[PDB]
Amino acid sequence: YSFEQAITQLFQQLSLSIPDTIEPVIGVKVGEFACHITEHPVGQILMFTLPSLDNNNEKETLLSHNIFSQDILKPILSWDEVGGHPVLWNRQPLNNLDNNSLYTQLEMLVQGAERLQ
Amino acid sequence: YSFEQAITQLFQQLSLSIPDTIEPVIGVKVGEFACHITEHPVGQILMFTLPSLDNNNEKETLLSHNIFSQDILKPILSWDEVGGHPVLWNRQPLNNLDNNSLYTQLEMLVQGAERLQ
Structure with missing residues (x-):
């Protein structure tokens, strides 16, 4: 559980x-x-969300969001081939969770989503 | 250590x-x-490597590599803005390592790199 x-x-x-x-x-x-x-x-x-992108930017700019950083919760911008929409997602282990760990992950995903717009 | x-x-x-x-x-x-x-x-x-891409493909195809999968070691395709080159990378915790964990990560990164070509 x-x-x-x-x-x-x-x-x-x-x-x-x-x-x-x-x-x-x-x-x-x-x-x-x-x-x-x-x-x-x-x-x-x-965790994932379907962002409302800004793709008047080159491959390089969208792929630039995906560089690793100090925060493993920094979300990754991907494309769902099977559904034809961008997918922004992050991930962390369930066993290493502090009490607020999912809240932090959710906040990092959404901040990533807000940045994309 | x-x-x-x-x-x-x-x-x-x-x-x-x-x-x-x-x-x-x-x-x-x-x-x-x-x-x-x-x-x-x-x-x-x-772990990261600098891949030898195939960017005659749209934003959608390069971003399509980055969809999450069942394997957390599946590498992520990014762009290094500061250096002007793609960067393919994956990551896993040091504390949850089996004896072969880095070897698996290295093999997953390289298989990802080989796929890109």
């Missing part, structure tokens, strides 16, 4: 009602952004 | 001589690919 427990803690931090059963994929709304939270692979919390 | 110890194990698995001191950044050659291994941030093993 690390996933169920992790989501329960996040929901309390977002002031959301806690469903009696919690399975992926879990959606949460943060400001303008619909975000999706799953466990994938096992032991990893994966 | 998790970094020193991790590199020592990798070097034995690559049949490389072990230097008396081991600090980032560590370079290793795997087939056609010069790879670079560092600890960044602390507790994370970061």
